[PDB]
């Protein structure tokens, strides 16, 4: 049981879609479609398995004010769904610094246990974006050891949530050409801009999946082939 991205091409690259019990990271420049894929996943996860979802709820942690509840409505309506119910099934939190971002993962644990054995459990946790607060707050050579200690602890908490509660953790990371915030991820996907409103996804760290690329479009339905 995997969460469809909305793109048949990007799902085949991922072996069916985004996995639970894993952290799936997309990285790329600004504008490559990371936040759009996250918004689509927040909707897709609500669908029944036959339509590409997991009959679940989504949690969205927003570190840069990128969350657009209207965009969720747009995606839901164009896919034949109630924009109201789609919004009812997404838990949302704005993280204003890296300490708040870390506490939210701890608090997400409480929300997940509660729904764990119900009809619509949480199935997706989004962190958009994972690193930005760490880059901006840990300033100077004197702060780099603590920066990695906190980033490492934060990824350990996310891995633990994913395994405990059988949820997909989807994180976005803004890697620019051209400063390195190393961190663990189960799956890494590089996004870049393509021909017009197309985007290209490349598998970077994928243990046994065949390497390769996939093309997808940003449409009114979220992400599409
Ligand atoms: C009509 O316009 C809208 C605008 C936005 C929405 C969004 C989608 N819904 C919400 O904001 C809903 C409804 C009001 C409170 N609320 C929450 O989700 C409150 N969330 C939390 O307390 C919380 C706590 C810890 C978390 C840790 C990780 C991730 C998420 C977390 N969320 C709905 C309608």
Using CB atoms within 10 A of its CB, is residue 191 exposed (0-12), middle (13-18) or buried (19+)?
Answer: buried
The domain segmentation of the chain, as residue ranges, is 1-225
Outline where 139-178 has alpha helix (H).
144-165
For ligand 1, the distance from its centroid to the CA atom of residue 92, given in whole angstroms, is 3
CA of 17 to the centre of ligand 1 (A): 25
Question: Which tokens in the block code for residue 114?
Answer: 């509660």
Q: Which residues pair with 61 in a beta bridge?
A: 93, 127
Residue 92 Cα: closest atom of ligand 1: 18
User: Rounded to an integer, what distance in angstroms lies between the CA atom of residue 197 and that of residue 219?
Assistant: 8
Hey, CA dihedral for 102, 106, 111, 117, is it positive or negative? positive
Q: List, as one string, the DSSP characters of 74-134.
A: HHHHHTT--HHHHHHTEEEEE--SHHHHHHHHHHHHHHHHHHTTSSS-EEEEEEETSSHHH
Q: Which DSSP symbol is given to 150?
A: H
32 labelled as ligand-binding?
yes
Does 33 appear as a known binding residue? Answer: yes
What is the resolution of the experimental data for this entry, in Å? 2.3
Distance 156 CA to ligand 1 centre (A): 24
- β-pairing verdict for 57-62 and 90-94: parallel
Q: How far is the CA of 105 from the centre of ligand 1 (A)?
A: 14
CA distance 157 to 166: 14
Q: Which of 62, 93, 94, 95 to mutate to test the pocket of ligand 1 (most atoms within 8 A of CB)?
A: 93
Tell me if 30 is assigned to a ligand binding site: yes
Residues with CB under 6 A from ligand 1: 59, 61, 69, 87, 90-93, 104, 107-108
Could you give the C-alpha distances from 207 to 102, 175, 186, 212, in angstroms and in order? Answer: 28, 21, 9, 13
Distance CA 46, CA 41 (A): 9
Residue 149, SS3 per DSSP: helix
Tell me how the structure was determined: X-ray
Q: Which atom of ligand 1 is nearest to the CA of 90?
A: 8
Q: Which atom of ligand 1 is nearest to the CA of 126?
A: 29
């Amino acid at each position: 049981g995997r969460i469809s991205t909305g793109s048949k091409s990007l799902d085949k690259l991922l072996g069916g879609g985004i996995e639970t019990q894993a952290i799936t990271e997309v990285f790329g420049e600004f504008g490559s479609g990371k936040t759009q894929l996250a918004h689509t996943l927040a909707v897709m996860v609500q669908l029944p398995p036959e339509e590409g979802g997991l009959n679940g709820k989504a949690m969205y942690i927003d570190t840069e004010g990128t969350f657009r509840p209207e965009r969720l409505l747009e995606i839901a309506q164009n896919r034949g769904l109630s924009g109201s119910d789609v919004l009812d099934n997404v838990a949302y939190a704005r993280a204003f610094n890296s300490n708040h971002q870390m506490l939210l993962v701890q608090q997400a644990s409480d929300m997940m246990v509660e729904l764990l054995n119900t009809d619509r459990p949480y199935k997706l946790l989004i962190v958009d974006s994972l690193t930005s607060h760490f880059r901006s707050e840990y300033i100077g050579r004197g702060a780099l050891a603590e920066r990695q200690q906190k980033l490492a602890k934060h990824l350990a908490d996310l891995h633990r949530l994913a395994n405990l509660y059988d949820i997909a953790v989807f994180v976005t990371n803004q890697v620019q050409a051209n400063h390195i915030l190393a961190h663990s991820a189960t799956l890494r996907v590089y996004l870049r801009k393509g021909k017009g409103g197309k985007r290209i996804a490349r598998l970077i760290d994928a243990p046994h999946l065949p390497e390769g690329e996939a093309v997808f479009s940003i449409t009114e339905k979220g992400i599409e082939d």
